[PDB]
Scaffold this motif. Structure first.
Motif, PDB file in Angstrom:
ATOM      1  N   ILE A   1       0.819  -1.153  -0.072  1.00  0.00           N
ATOM      2  CA  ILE A   1       0.088  -0.014  -0.069  1.00  0.00           C
ATOM      3  C   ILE A   1       0.842   1.190  -0.064  1.00  0.00           C
ATOM      4  CG2 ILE A   1      -2.002   1.265   1.194  1.00  0.00           C
ATOM      5  CD1 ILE A   1      -2.711  -1.523   0.063  1.00  0.00           C
ATOM      6  N   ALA A   2       2.088   1.137   0.536  1.00  0.00           N
ATOM      7  CA  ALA A   2       3.050   2.141   0.642  1.00  0.00           C
ATOM      8  C   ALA A   2       3.973   2.562  -0.873  1.00  0.00           C
ATOM      9  CB  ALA A   2       4.136   1.902   1.551  1.00  0.00           C
ATOM     10  N   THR A   3       3.917   1.303  -1.641  1.00  0.00           N
ATOM     11  CA  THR A   3       4.349   1.599  -2.985  1.00  0.00           C
ATOM     12  C   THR A   3       3.972   2.284  -3.947  1.00  0.00           C
ATOM     13  OG1 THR A   3       3.500  -0.592  -3.677  1.00  0.00           O
ATOM     14  CG2 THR A   3       5.454  -0.859  -2.476  1.00  0.00           C
ATOM     15  N   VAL A   4       2.395   2.316  -3.711  1.00  0.00           N
ATOM     16  CA  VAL A   4       1.649   3.223  -4.519  1.00  0.00           C
ATOM     17  C   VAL A   4       1.441   4.422  -4.238  1.00  0.00           C
ATOM     18  CG1 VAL A   4      -0.523   2.670  -3.149  1.00  0.00           C
ATOM     19  CG2 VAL A   4      -0.770   3.344  -5.900  1.00  0.00           C
ATOM     20  N   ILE A   5       1.439   4.989  -2.821  1.00  0.00           N
ATOM     21  CA  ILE A   5       1.461   6.122  -2.562  1.00  0.00           C
ATOM     22  C   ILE A   5       2.825   6.910  -2.785  1.00  0.00           C
ATOM     23  CG2 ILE A   5       1.562   7.702  -0.400  1.00  0.00           C
ATOM     24  CD1 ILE A   5       0.321   5.064   1.256  1.00  0.00           C
ATOM     25  N   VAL A   6       3.829   6.320  -3.073  1.00  0.00           N
ATOM     26  CA  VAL A   6       5.122   7.115  -3.495  1.00  0.00           C
ATOM     27  C   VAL A   6       4.897   7.515  -4.906  1.00  0.00           C
ATOM     28  CG1 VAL A   6       7.526   6.619  -3.981  1.00  0.00           C
ATOM     29  CG2 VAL A   6       6.280   5.498  -1.862  1.00  0.00           C
ATOM     30  N   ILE A   7       4.412   6.739  -5.896  1.00  0.00           N
ATOM     31  CA  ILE A   7       4.446   6.965  -7.186  1.00  0.00           C
ATOM     32  C   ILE A   7       3.192   8.003  -7.309  1.00  0.00           C
ATOM     33  CG2 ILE A   7       5.244   5.058  -8.029  1.00  0.00           C
ATOM     34  CD1 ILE A   7       2.509   3.648  -8.439  1.00  0.00           C
ATOM     35  N   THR A   8       2.305   8.053  -6.388  1.00  0.00           N
ATOM     36  CA  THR A   8       1.149   9.054  -6.395  1.00  0.00           C
ATOM     37  C   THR A   8       1.598  10.371  -6.578  1.00  0.00           C
ATOM     38  OG1 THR A   8      -0.368   7.499  -5.060  1.00  0.00           O
ATOM     39  CG2 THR A   8      -0.973  10.027  -5.279  1.00  0.00           C
ATOM     40  N   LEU A   9       2.372  10.742  -5.655  1.00  0.00           N
ATOM     41  CA  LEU A   9       3.059  12.107  -5.801  1.00  0.00           C
ATOM     42  C   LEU A   9       3.753  12.501  -6.972  1.00  0.00           C
ATOM     43  CD1 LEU A   9       2.450  13.777  -2.813  1.00  0.00           C
ATOM     44  CD2 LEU A   9       2.481  11.222  -2.540  1.00  0.00           C
ATOM     45  N   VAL A  10       4.175  11.269  -7.488  1.00  0.00           N
ATOM     46  CA  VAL A  10       4.907  11.633  -8.783  1.00  0.00           C
ATOM     47  C   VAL A  10       3.810  12.160 -10.021  1.00  0.00           C
ATOM     48  CG1 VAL A  10       6.556  10.545 -10.671  1.00  0.00           C
ATOM     49  CG2 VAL A  10       6.494  10.025  -8.144  1.00  0.00           C
ATOM     50  N   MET A  11       2.447  11.752  -9.680  1.00  0.00           N
ATOM     51  CA  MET A  11       1.611  11.915 -10.788  1.00  0.00           C
ATOM     52  C   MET A  11       1.092  13.420 -10.735  1.00  0.00           C
ATOM     53  SD  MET A  11       0.029   8.168 -11.163  1.00  0.00           S
ATOM     54  CE  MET A  11      -1.297   8.765 -12.447  1.00  0.00           C
ATOM     55  N   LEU A  12       1.195  13.730  -9.354  1.00  0.00           N
ATOM     56  CA  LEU A  12       0.580  15.166  -8.899  1.00  0.00           C
ATOM     57  C   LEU A  12       1.135  16.246  -9.774  1.00  0.00           C
ATOM     58  CD1 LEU A  12      -0.358  14.410  -5.246  1.00  0.00           C
ATOM     59  CD2 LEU A  12      -1.905  14.193  -7.326  1.00  0.00           C
TER      60      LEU A  12
END
Length: 30
Positions: free
Chosen positions: A16-27
């Motif tokens: 669940i943490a692996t997806v949160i990291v890439i999320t900020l990259v899409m913002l």
């Protein structure tokens, strides 16, 4: 039992943490 099962959620939470990291990259895109 007694904070014993708390570790179980820590195992499936690693993914669940692996997806949160890439999320900020899409913002930054917007």
């Amino acid at each position: 039992s007694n904070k014993g099962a708390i570790i179980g959620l820590m195992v499936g939470g690693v993914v669940i943490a692996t997806v949160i990291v890439i999320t900020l990259v899409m913002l930054k895109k917007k």
